[PDB]
Amino acid sequence: RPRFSFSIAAREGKARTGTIEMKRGVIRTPAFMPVGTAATVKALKPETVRATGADIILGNTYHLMLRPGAERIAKLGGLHSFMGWDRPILTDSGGYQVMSLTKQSEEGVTFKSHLSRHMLSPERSIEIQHLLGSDIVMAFDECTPYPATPSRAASSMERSMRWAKRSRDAFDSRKEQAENAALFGIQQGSVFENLRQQSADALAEIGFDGYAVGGLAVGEGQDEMFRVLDFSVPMLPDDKPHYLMGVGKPDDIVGAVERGIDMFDCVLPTRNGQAFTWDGPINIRNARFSEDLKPLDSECHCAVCQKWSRAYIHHLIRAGEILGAMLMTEHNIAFYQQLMQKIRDSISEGRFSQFAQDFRARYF
Amino acid sequence: RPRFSFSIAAREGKARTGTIEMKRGVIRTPAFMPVGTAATVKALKPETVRATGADIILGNTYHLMLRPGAERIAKLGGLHSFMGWDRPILTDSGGYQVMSLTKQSEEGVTFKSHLSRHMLSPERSIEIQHLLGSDIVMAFDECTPYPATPSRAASSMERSMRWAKRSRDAFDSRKEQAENAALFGIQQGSVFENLRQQSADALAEIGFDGYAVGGLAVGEGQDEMFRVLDFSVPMLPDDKPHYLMGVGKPDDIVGAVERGIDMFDCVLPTRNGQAFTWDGPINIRNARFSEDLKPLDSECHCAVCQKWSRAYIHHLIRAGEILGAMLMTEHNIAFYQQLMQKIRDSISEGRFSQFAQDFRARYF
Ligand SMILES: NCc1cc(CSc2ccccc2)c2nc(N)[nH]c(=O)c2c1
Ligand SMILES: NCc1cc(CSc2ccccc2)c2nc(N)[nH]c(=O)c2c1
Ligand SMILES: [Zn+2]
Ligand SMILES: [Zn+2]
What we know:
The structure is a homodimer.
Chain A: E1 4-12, E2 15-22, E3 25-29, E4 31-36, H1 46-51, E5 57-59, H2 61-66, H3 70-75, H4 79-83, E6 89-91, H5 95-98, E7 103-105, E8 108-112, E9 117-120, H6 122-132, E10 136-138, H7 150-172, H8 175-180, E11 182-187, H9 193-206, E12 210-213, H10 222-232, E13 242-244, H11 250-257, E14 263-266, E15 274-275, E16 282-283, H12 303-307, H13 310-319, H14 322-348, H15 352-363
The complex binds the ligand NCc1cc(CSc2ccccc2)c2nc(N)[nH]c(=O)c2c1 (2 copies) and zinc ion (2 copies).
């Protein structure tokens, strides 16, 4: 396969469905990428993650650069070999996480490990992602708090764009990385239209393989997020993937696809007790499920719903058993993948708008 | 298959190898039974437990009678359906656990839940095991502390024998249970030969499908345990299974089989960091494994050793990841099953004594 090839097979309104071809495999879009925190998708073997239908997973750089360390993972053969996942892996730049879990400057960010002093710059972020063996590398950007004043949002966005250029050059100056991986730029600008436009223009001028909409899902609310996506997504190059970072609630995903987003990721799927169903989420810890012999969801095709009851999983979670987390997580990730499949098929068949309507009606 | 049929196919010295045929499946002996605490073998799906080679698992009655409750499990269809394990399940009587995790009397034991007031008697213990749908029911016995004076050991053993008779009658008075399950008696008597003899004689007079050697593995040390087994096992009926409760260290198992034991169980296999290998146990948390690309064990045929390195599992356990527990547990249970297979094959081939010798030499 080629290093990177995004092809759009069908469209409906702003929604698109297609594929991203990479050396390690094909990614069907719209896609949901399960998140692995410490070189592992919480409570699941890689084969199980694949069984749910995932084509790509997200690697949590921040934690990996601290433990076991980027250099160490490289010495061990790379993240793919390390964790046993041979398909595409997208890695975040680590900067956003650092400013959430820190001396900031135009050169980067210095911070103390939450679990020592560490320095992170656009150049070091790209190098770390290279050492991990990432297939999709994210540009190193600055976190823009919410709410943010227009002045602060502008300064942050402008810095991010300068860092986007440094990320591009660092990526290109490394032969092995430039020829085998892809690089995504990240749009910033808070909730301001003019800033989002400036960011999109700057990103397009530099040129990237894909464009992420960053700075959202920071407590603005779905209404506000959708409002921002309405004018923000069309600003990005149409022929490249659009990735909405950190968005995963089912209803958020459907609305985001309706607005042109092609890729998603979130830790929501992965012992809270919340299980997603087509009739809305349920918390399995609730006493009403203690003797419910039905599966988590009545239509779900996952292995958990074929073999165990709500009553059993209820018992597991309330007992604090590891198997409870294993089963809840497999079902949730399987549910998310089934949602993406329904979205892809509906778009391919030109009935996505209707699917969105039916989904919402039953989910709520 | 029949309700219960133990057949001895081959012998060498005091060691035996054969099968126990039951309605839900065949159990190969010597057998190792993985222990499931709360209706689950720690961090493993039932299919994975079976994949390791286990023919039967042990159900932890004490915890189940408290959560989710015996009556509830019965309402839900039984433990087999509940947890998704359709093969034989052996359940302990719960009395021993109660006196470890309490007003005692000739009628039974009253106690307060560690996680309310509850009463447990020989009759109630058998009923609980019936409600759980146990295939191999253990007689309700009294815990004999260690060390124990001859007088106290005698009183406890005598009470246990009276309770063994009550267990037998309770079991037989329940048609469905008597016709579909098996009942094992438990020998007591501490480390005293005369008491063990009295207990064995009492148990044989009553008549059981199998006989367990109880009261050992209570801090006496392998030397002392082996000394007690030397004279205790021959006292039990030769044509019925001999089950050593709570014994599982690899070397203990080999020595116990050399002394006539056919069944084992222990929580040792199931984030401590200890992984069993043919060259002895290792603690994966040790820094020396941080960049060790080799599998847990060089010969082990389990899925964990075929796919992941010590370095990765080291990272997982030190990071507190659930997958670490999943992988460590699967390997350990697989290792135990491989040990039992080597024991069974060596006995069948009349070279068990040699196997024991070679095992010890390399393990230590
Ligand atoms: N709060 C939404 C969100 C989430 C992430 C994290 S995406 C991620 C990172 C590591 C593991 C899994 C997902 C972001 N990352 C970057 N670089 N920029 C953003 O604007 C942003 C916004
Ligand atoms: N300390 C060894 C040991 C362990 C168990 C517990 S075996 C078990 C119970 C529940 C779950 C798994 C294994 C015992 N149980 C009974 N009834 N009698 C004993 O003498 C004895 C000695
Ligand atoms: Zn499901
Ligand atoms: Zn192994």
